[PDB]
Amino acid sequence: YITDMSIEEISREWYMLMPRQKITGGLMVKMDQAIMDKRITLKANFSVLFDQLETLVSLRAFTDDGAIVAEISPIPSMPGHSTEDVKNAIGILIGGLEWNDNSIRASENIQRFA
Amino acid sequence: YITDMSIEEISREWYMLMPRQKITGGLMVKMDQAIMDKRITLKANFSVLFDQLETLVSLRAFTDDGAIVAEISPIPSMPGHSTEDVKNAIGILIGGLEWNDNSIRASENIQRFA
């Protein structure tokens, strides 16, 4: 099991100026269209089996000022999913952010297991 | 050499309310951020060689409305783009559009050669 976020930072209620979402694999992917020209920093809490991602808890995206603008949590009702599902939820999100000229950096673990 | 687009279509000028344009290779994807939940159809005029694509002249995207909301055109300063470039511009455009809950359909010719 791995962690990039304070139990606080993962339990922090957050909201969007311009809500967007996309449901993939077993993964909900939300992200605020309002954000542009910022650095976004990706932090995932997740589990691992045999040196590889096993299950995602939450990935959240922070700005320089530590605000969260996008999350990638499992589906509430129907969460079962693989890790190949995750790499895509991320491509998806990252893709959306970079459309608004934001530049993206990812947690170290996030790059090891994805 | 293939043409989904009547000359009027590929020549006509067109506008956006929430413009956004990414770059990839020698190609310039612009899209109107202001469009939500519309069906978009991709028509592309392009040159083919053998049984695969050669040079995009342009790819525009239309609502059932006939209005063009996106365009993947070759950058004038450097004009050269690649086959793979085009594959990327398109994926990028789908993705950027599909965030606004838009549904896409591609011309036969596009699906055939890309």
Residue numbers in the entry:
A (entry chain B), B (entry chain A): 89 to 202
What does the paper say about this structure?
In contrast, several possible ED homodimer interfaces have been proposed based upon crystal structures obtained using NS1 proteins from various strains. Although the helix-helix dimer interface is shared by all structures of the NS1 ED, and may have some biological role in that RNA-binding activity of NS1 is affected by its disruption, we noted that in all helix-helix structures the arrangement of the two ED monomers differs markedly relative to one another. Previous studies using recombinant Alb/76 and Ud/72 EDs have shown that a single W187A amino-acid substitution is sufficient to prevent dimerization. However, at this same concentration we routinely observe complete dimerization of the PR8 and Alb/76 NS1 EDs.
During infection the influenza A virus NS1 protein participates in multiple protein-RNA and protein-protein interactions to perform a plethora of functions. The N-terminal 73 amino-acid residues of NS1 form a symmetrical homodimeric RNA-binding domain (RBD), which is connected to the central effector domain (ED; residues 86-204) via an inter-domain linker. Present models of the tertiary and quaternary structures of NS1 indicate that the protein possesses two globular domains, each capable of forming independent homodimeric interactions. Our bioinformatic analyses indicate that the N-terminal RBD forms a very stable homodimer, while the predominant and ubiquitous helix-helix contacts between C-terminal EDs bear many similarities with weak transient interfaces.
